[PDB]
Amino acid sequence: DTQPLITHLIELRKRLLNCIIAVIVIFLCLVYFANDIYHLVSAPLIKQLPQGSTMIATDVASPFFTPIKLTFMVSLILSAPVILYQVWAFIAPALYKHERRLVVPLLVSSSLLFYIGMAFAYFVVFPLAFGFLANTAPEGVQVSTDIASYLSFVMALFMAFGVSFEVPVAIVLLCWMGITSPEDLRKKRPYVLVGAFVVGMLLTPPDVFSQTLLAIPMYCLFEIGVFFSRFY
Amino acid sequence: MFDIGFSELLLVFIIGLVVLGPQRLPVAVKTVAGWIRALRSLATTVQNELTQELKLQEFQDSLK
Amino acid sequence: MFDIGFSELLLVFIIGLVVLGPQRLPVAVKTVAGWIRALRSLATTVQNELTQELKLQEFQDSLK
């Protein structure tokens, strides 16, 4: 069913507005608690900071705009079900019946696993990592964590865990529908390892640290996904 | 635009050479080049279609 | 290079779609594309003019 370009842009504008309205309304209901929301996010770090160590703000606008930046992305995460539905409704006529049987399970399962990524990272990984990182400084070095740097690190881990949690289930689903077999995944192992570094390079700043902090979660959790593909 | 560093690119080729090997890395780069070639070919033909539709919209809008 | 971020570019297109609309954003992008096309055309012709003048200077300087 061919349609004029404006028809697709009319629909896209309507769906984009519903995404912006959802984010703004959630942001307005949450912007008043920006400092309280930052206390929750920085709670794992504060509990593990050494005696005499406290968080600092090295930027003039950081004390205000870093909590504001945090509650904005919290709004984006909380509005993901609305955003994903608008994405689904825009791409629903494009998908065929056979492609509909795969995208719908992916969209629903991604949302839950992406939240379990934060729950696992916040309640398990953050206490373990912060208790080690904050107490491994060289002698004479005072751990004074910048609030702007901490927010970037936390969202880097939250995005990494949420995305990488979906990889094993996506692999198992692809094995279930028959798109890919465990045998074919084992012979594509060298390419995924190189491909993981390529994906990490593109989606991260040119620092190698950000490349490896992302690529290793994909390739490792790719390997676990192949393991459960046997039990299916 | 994606931010690509020289160190990041060298690591990819270094890892690709030691993992894929002398016989699979050139084919992998050739395959990736074809993907980018097809991506730009698809981008060009769609932009041509959008330009042709915009002219049709102007013809309809001008009359009405 | 002007430093352009993916988030910055998406914001412009998102804001342009909701402000200009489905009927004015494509024309706005088309107009801006023509500006860049004319900008690169102007750069190319002047470089050709500069290259020709440099050849003339060499002829004059070599004789003198």
Partner: peptide, 27 residues
């Protein structure tokens, strides 16, 4: 133009911009 071709083309243009900048698209 159909919805599938619109989505496919839009992603291709976005991918080109991420690999060659916004000036390449307008070329």
């Amino acid at each position: 133009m159909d919805r599938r071709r619109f989505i496919k083309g839009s992603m291709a243009m976005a991918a080109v911009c991420g690999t060659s900048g916004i000036a390449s698209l307008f070329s």
